[PDB]
Amino acid sequence: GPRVTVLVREFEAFDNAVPELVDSFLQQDPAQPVVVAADTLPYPPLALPRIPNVRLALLQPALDRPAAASRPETYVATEFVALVPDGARAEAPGLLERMVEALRAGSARLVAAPVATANPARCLALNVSLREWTARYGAAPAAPRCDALDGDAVVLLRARDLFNLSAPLARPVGTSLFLQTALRGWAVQLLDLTFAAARQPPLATAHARWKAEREGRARRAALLRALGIRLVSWEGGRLEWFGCNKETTRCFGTVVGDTPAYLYEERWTPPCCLRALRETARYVVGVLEAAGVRYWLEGGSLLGAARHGDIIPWDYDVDLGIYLEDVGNCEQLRGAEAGSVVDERGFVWEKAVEGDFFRVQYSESNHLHVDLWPFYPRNGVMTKDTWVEFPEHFLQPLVPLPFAGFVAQAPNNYRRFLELKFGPGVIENPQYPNPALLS
Amino acid sequence: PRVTVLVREFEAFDNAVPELVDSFLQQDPAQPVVVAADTLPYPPLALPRIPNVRLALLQPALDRPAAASRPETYVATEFVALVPDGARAEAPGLLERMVEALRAGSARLVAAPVATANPARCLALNVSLREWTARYGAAPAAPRCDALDGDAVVLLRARDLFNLSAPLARPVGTSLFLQTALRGWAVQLLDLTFAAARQPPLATAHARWKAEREGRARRAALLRALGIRLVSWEGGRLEWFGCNKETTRCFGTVVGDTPAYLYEERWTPPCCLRALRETARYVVGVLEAAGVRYWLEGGSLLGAARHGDIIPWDYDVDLGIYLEDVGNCEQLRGAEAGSVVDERGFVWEKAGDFFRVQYSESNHLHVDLWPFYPRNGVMTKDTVEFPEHFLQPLVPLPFAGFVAQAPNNYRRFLELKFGPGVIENPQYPN
Amino acid sequence: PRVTVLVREFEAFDNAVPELVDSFLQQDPAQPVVVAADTLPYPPLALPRIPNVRLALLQPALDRPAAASRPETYVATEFVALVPDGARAEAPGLLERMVEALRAGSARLVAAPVATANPARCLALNVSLREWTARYGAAPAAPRCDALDGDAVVLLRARDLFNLSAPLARPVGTSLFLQTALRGWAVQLLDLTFAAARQPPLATAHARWKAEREGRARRAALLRALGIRLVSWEGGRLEWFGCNKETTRCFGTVVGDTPAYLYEERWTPPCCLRALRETARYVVGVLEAAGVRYWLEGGSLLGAARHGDIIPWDYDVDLGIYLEDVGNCEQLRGAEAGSVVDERGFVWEKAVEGDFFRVQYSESNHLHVDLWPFYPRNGVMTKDTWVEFPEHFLQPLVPLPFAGFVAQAPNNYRRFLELKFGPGVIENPQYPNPALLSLTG
Amino acid sequence: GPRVTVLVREFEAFDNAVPELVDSFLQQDPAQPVVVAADTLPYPPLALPRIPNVRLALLQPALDRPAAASRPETYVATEFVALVPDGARAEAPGLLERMVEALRAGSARLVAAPVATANPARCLALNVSLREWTARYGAAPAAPRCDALDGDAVVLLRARDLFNLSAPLARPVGTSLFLQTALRGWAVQLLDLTFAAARQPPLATAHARWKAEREGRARRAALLRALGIRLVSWEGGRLEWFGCNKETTRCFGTVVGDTPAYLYEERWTPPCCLRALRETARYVVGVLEAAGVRYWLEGGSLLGAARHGDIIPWDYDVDLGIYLEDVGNCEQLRGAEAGSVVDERGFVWEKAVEGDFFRVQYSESNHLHVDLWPFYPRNGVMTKDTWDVEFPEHFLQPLVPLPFAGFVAQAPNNYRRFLELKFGPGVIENPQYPNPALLSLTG
């Protein structure tokens, strides 16, 4: 009744137990369909049995092959497919059949069986938010029904479901598969069945292990970058980042038309970029306060503070107003008028090209910035020479207002200040930076 | 509902297999297709070189493993559809509908005719290995039948097809249903119809004649391999695949009078039985032409009394003759000097008490003639006896398609020679 | 019990298999024994009716499952010992001794001679599927061999034997080592001897004659089925199993210009090459006696310049001739009026299509030499149907070995070839490419 | 209904004329199907007309898209596709239909029309050899029938043919398309039709051109490495290399079970590896001749010299024999007995792990090597006390010149005999190129 193709994707060419894996399934059924998938032909040779029911699917482009040759669904003729990791072995007979039976009888589109390795699979919850570039894992509230798995498992599903995914075999599969299935609201049922481990497991030496863990980590980082996951969180608070830092370029490059590239991709500001802007805003405020420079939250930064005490989630910089006469109080600002200045913490201060303002960048390589706009009073009206004006009484006095994790100084009556600069109801009506292009 | 298309019946010199395959790929580009052949077809089929289309070469090769010639290893799906050359897929989901009918019905095979010039028809089929015979007729319970004649897509479970002894032996239309009918399986001839190829194969008369010739040769080789010596039809037509006047007989030299077919748990090959009947008829004609008194003897008289024919596991014919009449017939006179091959190719020899007439020089199915003489009211030979009144007179008795001569009161005669109740209690081989 | 005795080489009408089986059961009543046959042997073998002795009938049958004709179905031990008829177990423990030898050495097979009149000899064997040739010779590293000649018990793992395509194809002594030698497997001939049967089979001249006639027929059918067209011993004593003067050529009609053997990932059959060499030598001899100027052309000239023979994946021979010399040859004059079969069976024909002449090996075998007549016009040899070349390449002609005789070639033939084919053609063969042929067609 | 889909793949996000291109085709037929294909959403925005017959095809995996979304055939519903490069514009009406008419009536799978830029397309010959990892370009002998094009052209072919290729839209299309079509034996016919250039051409400054060329050359280098093209040549020269060199590891790395990785790929030795082997062989021979070491071609090197004067194209090292008595003549060899020596030109000389031979590697990183096998006479026989079959000494008295790998080396006298003794009768005449099927069976 049930035909199941075994599909092997997670293995290392320098050190693997794929021959044992495939032979253990052949011992239960000599005609068992098996597909080993690889990006390039493994060397040293896998030396799989060269029989028609065992096939190697190379997922690489080639001058002498058709398109179908790198599409793994054309190697799978059966209704069901079972993803089997290296290090597993078939020992008990008919396990795939019991998995098929459980899937037909259940409600999850995926069923799974742990492998009795030193790291068997465990049930996990998972939320994916592409707009915020974040994947949030947690403990499974309704185990053994999960959104994702952590560790080694045989995962069985219908071929039509697996190969309608965008990247069915992207490595690591343990990360890539459940990111895609959870996003679609699919569940994986963790069954009470266990596959045995290989008798001679792969990666038996500490050096061979260490080599494999580093290659895997490199593949996971590349995968998350390819798919737009900048941040992974775990319950307990553990964070791992996959985007910006002080030592790299910022994520999105130069902005045209006030609308950064990620907005056209229906995503908001990457969380790593937002983290850096908050750190730069916190730092610059500390420097100005220690130097005796009067400053106040400006533009979108003040708007975000008034709404929810933080940067607007699709914004990409921070604006502060300062008193023009106070500029000479700050060492970095005095230096900036002479040229670019890299200070005690690696931040870069410059007097800008465009319009008589200062710009503080997170680092020499990461150009996320705070802009400082000098104003001087003319007759109770704050103004500048290169370009709106506003009454000085909004700055007399300033008021405290949470922003980006700290307390910042804002104009008093900032609701009216914001409506004077943006229009009535701006606090209550969020918009994109300019809606004629994108709303 | 995954079904592998499997193509076995085509000719390399003239086929429509590329169109057949392309037509199924137009409905599903990932459709599993297996084209099976004994050797690599030339001119090249030039099938699409995609993973879901595969050529399975069934003959042994020095550079291949055992699995490479085993077809179940090319088929991963639950169901398999045998598709003949000349068919094409036009509407979608026809294999799906065949799968539904199979699961809904009670026949292990379902079939959909192909709209060729010879779309499949239902047939009844009765297979007797003991008698080396397959009997075909009209199907009483159509559209449920034992076998098909003509073009059809046939769908069954892969586990059923590939546990057969010769699942892809050619011609499939003969070999498959011989095996399924023997197992008591039925094929349901569904009401769906597959279209014919838009450019059919064998368009010329020469090509069709060539293909019919090769096909007849394959069917003959297949039936001889599988132990079918006779195919008979309702209405009387006979098809012979055994020995004849110019060949050896099917079983050769006998040892311990137990011919080889008995150890195979079979009876006498029907072609051998036919040759014995013709030799019996011929010899009787010669004997009666020359005025030689003969009567049925031994197992021949027993079979005549029982069912008017040779006992179906027997392998010769015995006749008694009056020793005093031997000189009346030329062949017997010659047989005393040496072997005589007469005008009709029969071989008469003396060799021994008796005379032996063989069907031909190559085919050694024979009639033995046993001369007796009346000594004092008892018939006797010189190397068991019986009273002469059993021959005074002789009586007509049908045997082997003609009217033979038998001793009078022959049921009593037979119980003399074999024991009481021999006619009613045949000694069946075991 | 780790070894199953398997008997495949015997004749139904005259064998010593009952003594063979008995001799092994006398040493161990539980010894697994399998007698393999295509059909039920007659007269009856009458083997002991015990669970460890089985007769395996390998032919498909209307009333049997697929497994009944698969020999691995009948073996449940790690090893198989192939034992020929005429052997007998006398000393106990011989099979266990072969297993120990096998495990401790590097050969996949180990063998023990049987003490018959034809005890097994160690042989070298190279199998070339591309050239359809099996080359035997004396074994340089005896007692490590590629093949055996004569009677021996051969032990190997059941997993190795039954993974082969034709594990029990007859004669086993031929088919087994063709398959194992191709895989690079060695057989080690041990210092162990099995005794001969006390009543040997085939003890009369007539019985031996019947057996050898049947054996020869099975061997010929086996080599044709497996694509071995030529068997040689030390490069000589050639045995042919392909086409000849009275048959069609092996590959038949070519479409369009890719013969069948290239799709089979092989080269030209050596019997076809042999017929081409004979035809080229005959035609050249005819042209020379008649006084027809000729020279090697095209791939024939390329082959001669490369290695003095036909390019081994090519399938014909090309010669250029002087058009004005055509009249000096009876066969060529006859060919312009119609097809001519000359006194030695060669068929000379004039191509109405391409304006050349064609000489075929025989009426049935269409391996051919093509003759291309050129005529000079202002010092350039040219033709009226289709590359032309300067006449000085033919003034004079030079000798050049080709296909076992000395042929005529243009002078400066290296330059000549480079002009026709391109620079470096002689040093860079266009080797057949199965992968590419699969792609292009 | 239209029968051609315009497909735009070659353009740069930072500076393109794709909006003008799309508009020019829509002006001839507002229903004209147009696909713009890209690996990521182009930024700045292309702002293409939001109509059903204009579509952006993003060829990238994404967590929220089905498999079909990244497959370009999904976006084409017509029989034909016209690949149009940025910088082109549709002015004359009906040019695509004339191309369809040309393709149907001719015998080329592809037809093309130059674009009137500063780099209009030219007709080229192209031979692709996967076994030799080489793409050989040249002037087209049968123009306007070509194997490949260089420069800007609109190329038309059946969608069924384009999207059946392994890498139909791999960049640069001008390189990857014709590598795939020429390998298949398909021809492209350059038609006598011309597309106009855009009124505002892209990449109009030297700086913009510089940025575009740097990226395009990076895409090309990555493309050829992924496809196994190690060498590009023009008219047999102007060599362009994409393999290993003195500063890298060799292509096939560590060899396991006497079978290098290129054999399992069903190819021969990479041409960069062969180039480095010839250079190392010439260098080592030059060193031995200057130092007064007697040497001769040995084994498969001698076989290759005798057969065609070069390394056997699927071999991966070089073997020479030397008189052991002469070893002390060479400084590098005398140092090699103490330990590894990196000489003045980066070559690494070592005395073997076990086996009593010397090894000279191309560099510290690149381990392509020449092996030197020392022999010594024991009364007429050459022998090494470690085991390269022993042979009579008269084959070395005298030595003979033999072309090998671009220079003249020394070989044993009567080398045909010599070779047949070591390899067997007829070895020179019977080369056996690798059999990947046999390899797939034997391992």
Ligand SMILES: *[C@@H]1O[C@H](CO)[C@@H](O)[C@H](O)[C@H]1NC(C)=O
């Ligand atoms: C059978 O032979 C093939 C070679 O064609 C090999 O790949 C496979 O591993 C072998 N299987 C066994 C069980 O030895």
Ligand SMILES: *[C@@H]1O[C@H](CO)[C@@H](O)[C@H](O)[C@H]1NC(C)=O
């Ligand atoms: C996932 O989202 C659901 C829906 O709001 C929420 O109840 C749950 O706490 C989230 N879990 C994690 C681990 O983010």
Ligand SMILES: *[C@@H]1O[C@H](CO)[C@@H](O)[C@H](O)[C@H]1NC(C)=O
């Ligand atoms: C995608 O799913 C459909 C049915 O929803 C199925 O017919 C098709 O084969 C699937 N595609 C792949 C590539 O698996």
Ligand SMILES: *[C@@H]1O[C@H](CO)[C@@H](O)[C@H](O)[C@H]1NC(C)=O
């Ligand atoms: C696709 O390309 C392969 C060659 O690799 C060929 O066999 C197949 O027929 C092609 N299919 C189409 C539709 O062109």
Ligand SMILES: *[C@@H]1O[C@H](CO)[C@@H](O)[C@H](O)[C@H]1NC(C)=O
């Ligand atoms: C098969 O046997 C049945 C009785 O079991 C008989 O009625 C039928 O006629 C036989 N088949 C044929 C084709 O005669």
Ligand SMILES: *[C@@H]1O[C@H](CO)[C@@H](O)[C@H](O)[C@H]1NC(C)=O
């Ligand atoms: C025979 O049938 C059994 C049970 O259905 C199955 O396990 C086996 O695979 C079949 N044999 C084949 C398909 O060759």
Ligand SMILES: *[C@@H]1O[C@H](CO)[C@@H](O)[C@H](O)[C@H]1NC(C)=O
């Ligand atoms: C077999 O091939 C080897 C080369 O690999 C050769 O030395 C030997 O002479 C050959 N033997 C025969 C009998 O051809």
Ligand SMILES: *[C@@H]1O[C@H](CO)[C@@H](O)[C@H](O)[C@H]1NC(C)=O
């Ligand atoms: C391509 O190959 C052909 C035939 O081998 C040859 O004539 C031609 O010169 C080659 N062209 C190039 C550019 O190498």
Ligand SMILES: [Mg+2]
């Ligand atoms: Mg802002």
Ligand SMILES: [Mg+2]
């Ligand atoms: Mg700003």
Ligand SMILES: [Mg+2]
């Ligand atoms: Mg046709």
Ligand SMILES: [Mg+2]
């Ligand atoms: Mg009798």
Ligand SMILES: [Mg+2]
């Ligand atoms: Mg020719």
Ligand SMILES: [Mg+2]
């Ligand atoms: Mg060498």
Ligand SMILES: [Mg+2]
């Ligand atoms: Mg070496």
Ligand SMILES: [Zn+2]
């Ligand atoms: Zn960032």
